[PDB]
Amino acid sequence: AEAGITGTWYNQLGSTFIVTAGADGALTGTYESAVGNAESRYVLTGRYDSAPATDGSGTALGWTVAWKNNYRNAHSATTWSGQYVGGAEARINTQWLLTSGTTEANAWKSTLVGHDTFTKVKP
Amino acid sequence: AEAGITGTWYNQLGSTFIVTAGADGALTGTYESAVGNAESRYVLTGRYDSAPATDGSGTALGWTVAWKNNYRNAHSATTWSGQYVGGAEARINTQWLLTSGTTEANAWKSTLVGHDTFTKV
Amino acid sequence: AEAGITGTWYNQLGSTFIVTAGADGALTGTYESAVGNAESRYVLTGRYDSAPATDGSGTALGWTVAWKNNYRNAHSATTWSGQYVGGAEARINTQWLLTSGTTEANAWKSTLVGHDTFTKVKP
Amino acid sequence: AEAGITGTWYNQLGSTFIVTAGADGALTGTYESAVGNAESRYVLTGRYDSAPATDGSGTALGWTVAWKNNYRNAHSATTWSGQYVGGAEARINTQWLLTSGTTEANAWKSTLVGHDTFTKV
Ligand SMILES: N=C1N[C@H]2[C@H](CS[C@H]2CCCCC(=O)O)N1
Ligand SMILES: N=C1N[C@H]2[C@H](CS[C@H]2CCCCC(=O)O)N1
Ligand SMILES: N=C1N[C@H]2[C@H](CS[C@H]2CCCCC(=O)O)N1
Ligand SMILES: N=C1N[C@H]2[C@H](CS[C@H]2CCCCC(=O)O)N1
């Protein structure tokens, strides 16, 4: 549901995610990371299943943040792939891939993988 | 390198995606796959880092495709994270995560991972 | 440290992991999964850093379980890659890859990725 | 297919691993890489599913290498998960996770992921 995803979310690292889910399946907002070579807010863009299922299945979504803004440029991009689960305590459980640009030679070590869980605070 | 991300790319599977790279880091376009519960074009939105470094590194980027369009809804979304490299043969090398919406009970098996290499050939 | 890893561990799904860390960096034991097309115990083999660092850095390790025993055969294998962190509450935090054998055609969907956290109960 | 996993394999990077596949699912051998804080041979231990299905599927397997030997200790371990396929050109297609031991503080960036294809060429 767009509404349910829309809001302010935080994860276990202390990062802030502000997103708006649009009617057409779009996600736009800004990400504030608590870690990494990242300072201030970064623009995020993603997509979600505007028409999930009835049942108590999560809503699949994903989004990308390139870590370049007017203050910094880490030359990397992270994509989070997960599911939104609503209820009294809504969560977005994700797995992410962080790719740094590298020379052909170090391309084998350009991507990190992890997982983040977000808890909603505001709409 | 710059601009050159813009165009039509194809992968091993036969998938095709057309993207437009905007001066400030946005990626917009459509994705048409060859495998899965997919049928036609899907909208894709991503970001790419517009000021890559000047050591011969690739340009980091990523995009998402929710697999829902006016014809099908596979209740899943794929995110590709990778880097673009130009030259006589430009390619985008990526790793992807495909998450399907599941009930709590099947959450452990909701995400597939793979890799795709796209070229303009 | 071999000792610290040796023991009985459980994760959030309810699976049992019984492992012995040998002096030479080896890990052997059995895995009892609570989910999947898996019944009874399965043999596991892995390796760990017998000489970690001083500091409060985790000990990197990894192990594999092919899901075939005398009772079942899911034709898949899972490898867990993570770190052991000791202390009063020792944990093994991992990320895993589950690959199912497939035809060339469905190879794109042969691997699942997730993460498990194990808590120690016994040696 | 069976037995055929046993042998010497090489990957794109130039890494080489020699493995022995035992009748009951064990994989044993040595791994020598071409990249990273690695120097010489490392011991590898894995498992492979000894009764693959009879639809033309690959044989699922996986192995681990802790990057410590008598010469170096990179305080990391790599696990490769994939499947073997035989034929005139047998190959092992894998995806790997490389975890480095870190302090809690850097736990978020402890694991790299990639893919390797090994052939006997
Ligand atoms: N809030 C989170 N931040 C880290 C993880 C996923 S992306 C990462 C921050 C990286 C910042 C930029 C960088 O270091 O390249 N979750
Ligand atoms: N070009 C690719 N197609 C498959 C992989 C990653 S995304 C995937 C197609 C999935 C279609 C929808 C589905 O089956 O859920 N790469
Ligand atoms: N204890 C765990 N079991 C599931 C995850 C990782 S492997 C998986 C069980 C799979 C069983 C065999 C199968 O279904 O193929 N953790
Ligand atoms: N053949 C491969 N070599 C690199 C990738 C995955 S494992 C890795 C070598 C790592 C060496 C030790 C290290 O740098 O930590 N594939």
Side-chain angles (χ1 to χ4, degrees), chain A residues 45-46 48-49 51-52 56-58 62-64 66 68 73 75-76 79-83 95 97 99-104 110, chain B residues 45-47 49-51 53 55 57-58 62-64 66 68 73 75 79-81 83 91 95 97 99-103 110-111:
Chain A
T45 181
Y48 69 113
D49 183 1
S57 282
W63 71 87
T64 303
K68 180 189 176 304
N73 191 346
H75 301 289
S76 59
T79 49
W80 282 259
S81 183
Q83 304 172 238
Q95 280 192 279
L97 295 179
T99 299
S100 296
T102 62
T103 53
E104 186 176 291
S110 61
Chain B
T45 187
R47 307 287 297 164
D49 196 304
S50 40
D55 55 317
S57 305
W63 71 87
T64 300
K68 178 181 175 299
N73 188 348
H75 304 292
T79 55
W80 283 257
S81 181
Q83 56 182 311
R91 43 178 169 111
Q95 278 272 194
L97 288 176
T99 298
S100 294
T102 64
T103 57
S110 62
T111 319

Side-chain angles (χ1 to χ4, degrees), chain C residues 105-118:
Chain C
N106 303 297
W108 67 274
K109 45 181 177 186
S110 61
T111 312
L112 291 170
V113 58
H115 49 85
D116 292 330
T117 299
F118 298 81

Side-chain angles (χ1 to χ4, degrees), chain B residues 11 13 15 31 33 35-38 67 76 78 80 96 98 116, chain C residues 108:
Chain B
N11 84 339
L13 314 185
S15 313
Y31 196 98
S33 193
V35 299
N37 168 8
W67 302 102
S76 58
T78 297
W80 283 257
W96 50 261
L98 190 178
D116 286 321
Chain C
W108 67 274

Side-chain angles (χ1 to χ4, degrees), chain C residues 13-103:
Chain C
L13 302 178
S15 302
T16 316
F17 172 52
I18 316 298
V19 60
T20 283
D24 57 349
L27 294 184
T28 46
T30 52
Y31 202 94
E32 180 123 43
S33 187
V35 307
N37 175 23
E39 92 141 67
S40 216
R41 316 228 296 223
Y42 297 86
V43 170
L44 72 90
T45 181
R47 305 288 295 162
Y48 69 113
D49 183 1
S50 23
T54 31
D55 33 43
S57 282
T59 299
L61 37 67
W63 71 87
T64 303
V65 171
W67 303 104
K68 180 189 176 304
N69 63 7
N70 296 150
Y71 308 104
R72 202 177 287 249
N73 191 346
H75 301 289
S76 59
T78 300
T79 49
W80 282 259
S81 183
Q83 304 172 238
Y84 156 79
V85 174
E89 288 183 68
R91 301 295 184 247
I92 287 176
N93 297 305
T94 62
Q95 280 192 279
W96 51 257
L97 295 179
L98 166 57
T99 299
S100 296
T102 62
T103 53

